[PDB]
Design an enzyme around this catalytic site. Sequence first.
Site, mmCIF file in Angstrom:
data_model
loop_
_atom_site.group_PDB
_atom_site.id
_atom_site.type_symbol
_atom_site.label_atom_id
_atom_site.label_comp_id
_atom_site.label_asym_id
_atom_site.label_seq_id
_atom_site.Cartn_x
_atom_site.Cartn_y
_atom_site.Cartn_z
ATOM 1 N N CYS A 1 0.614 -58.909 -2.729
ATOM 2 C CA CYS A 1 -0.482 -58.078 -2.258
ATOM 3 C C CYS A 1 -1.382 -58.933 -1.383
ATOM 4 O O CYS A 1 -0.948 -59.372 -0.316
ATOM 5 C CB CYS A 1 -1.135 -57.441 -3.494
ATOM 6 S SG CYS A 1 -2.445 -56.217 -3.215
ATOM 7 N N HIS B 1 0.230 -57.099 1.222
ATOM 8 C CA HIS B 1 -0.285 -55.743 1.323
ATOM 9 C C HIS B 1 -0.578 -55.449 2.795
ATOM 10 O O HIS B 1 -1.058 -56.327 3.509
ATOM 11 C CB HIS B 1 -1.564 -55.585 0.493
ATOM 12 C CG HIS B 1 -1.980 -54.160 0.320
ATOM 13 N ND1 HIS B 1 -2.647 -53.460 1.305
ATOM 14 C CD2 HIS B 1 -1.626 -53.244 -0.611
ATOM 15 C CE1 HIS B 1 -2.767 -52.197 0.939
ATOM 16 N NE2 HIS B 1 -2.177 -52.046 -0.235
#
EC number: 3.1.2.-
Lengths: 186, 186
Positions: free
Chosen positions: A104, A124
């Site tokens: 992420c 992400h």
Amino acid sequence: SKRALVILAKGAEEMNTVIPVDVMRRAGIKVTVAGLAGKDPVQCSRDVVICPDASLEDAKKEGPYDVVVLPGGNLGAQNLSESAAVKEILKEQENRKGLIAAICAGPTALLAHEIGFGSKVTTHPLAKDKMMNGGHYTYSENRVEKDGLILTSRGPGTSFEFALAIVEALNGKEVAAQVKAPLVLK
Amino acid sequence: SKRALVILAKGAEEMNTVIPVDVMRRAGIKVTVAGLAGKDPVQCSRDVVICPDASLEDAKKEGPYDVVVLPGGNLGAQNLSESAAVKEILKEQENRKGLIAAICAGPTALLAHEIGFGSKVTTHPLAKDKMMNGGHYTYSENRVEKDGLILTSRGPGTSFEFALAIVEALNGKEVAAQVKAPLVLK
């Protein structure tokens, strides 16, 4: 058994943190959840409060580990990025050719600490611009990317694939498949 | 805002617990993580230790809630099943026609407390026989099953779908879609 260090900082994404910890333990990996700031409970990004197994200060004495895991969460990743202890841990791990896994926003800490430059990575989507500042990595939109000893992934929804990739790297394909089946994955 | 009670017992599956808590909070639901045994930290099934927001004793005074959520984990679900407080909470919720959501072994606590008999339900595959003892429900292999106010799901790997189903029930389809997109789901 193989051993994992999961570095837990205020603002960590709790889903990113817990899914890999739990899946790695299912795989018979010895996982240490290490608190960046010490041994006290950590307030994650959506207010889930997790008690670490140990302080990072202590855990880093018990190295080295077969994988070092950086969860995401923007504010978590910023804390990781700012930490001298994290810099040292990651530089040592890279030097000894050990796996580093980040999910992420997590991979942005690799950039902060100049780790694995030249690797293909994913993050992400909202962390891409940060990761790519200076063009030190080559970006991927794969849900999990592994370029040698740098393993990266995108978000809460890729957490299982990320965790099972760590399991496959450490304990092999058969153990990953065995751990996968009882999870009821799609 | 809508309000959720998530009942957290020793041996809860931490993935089942954290994914719905986090996703519900992303949806602007006010979530109370309530410790079955009190306010002290809870050791989940794979040794992740979570600090509850409140004791169940306290939280149940602040009812009622728009959803009551039962995570899985065999040993967690057994603790839920044995609890008089949980029986009372679930009976009240059913009476007032409020949503009850249970995942993995969680739904077996519905059986223990005679909740929602006659409903179509799913569970973790290994919990089916327990759930179906006496034939009081009709079983489903869908990843998420909703039969009126009884919402059920199968495992860690269906946790996102389960959580987003709760979000859709409480806050509607558009909010569920909005929360879904940044998760990077497949």
